[PDB]
Design a protein around this ligand. Structure first.
Ligand SMILES: [Mg+2]
Length: 120
């Protein structure tokens, strides 16, 4: 339904802001930002695969908390949107390799645009 398209766009904008918050703030800890490793979904083609994102929302916040600029507010709005799109409690599978926070955000930003392109 269109209600599903709206919520993904809301989710896309929040993910869009976090990615733009790192690609414009370069001086603060180019060191520390590239060291966090996030677990990637094996296959992200269905709407239920947001379980792989929900479980990493808390580690995403702890990485953003080390950058002073509000991270706690953005992660909460992301959490409520994810809980309204994937919701059975399915067993999400992860890839073997970990990725950077930049690659992690681009993966789910691409995921939302992929599902938003599917519904339209
Ligand atoms: Mg890698």
């Amino acid at each position: 339904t269109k209600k599903t398209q709206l919520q993904l766009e809301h989710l896309l904008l929040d993910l869009q802001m976090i990615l733009n918050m790192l690609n414009n703030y370069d001086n603060p800890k180019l060191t520390r930002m590239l060291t966090f490793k996030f677990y990637m979904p094996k296959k992200a083609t269905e709407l239920k695969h947001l379980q792989c994102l929900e479980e990493e929302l808390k580690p995403l916040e702890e990485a953003l908390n080390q950058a002073q600029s509000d991270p706690r507010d953005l992660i909460s709005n992301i959490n409520v949107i994810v809980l309204e799109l994937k919701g059975t409690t399915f067993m999400c599978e992860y890839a073997d390799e970990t990725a950077t926070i930049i690659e992690f955000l681009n993966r789910w930003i691409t995921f939302c645009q992929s599902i938003i392109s599917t519904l339209t």
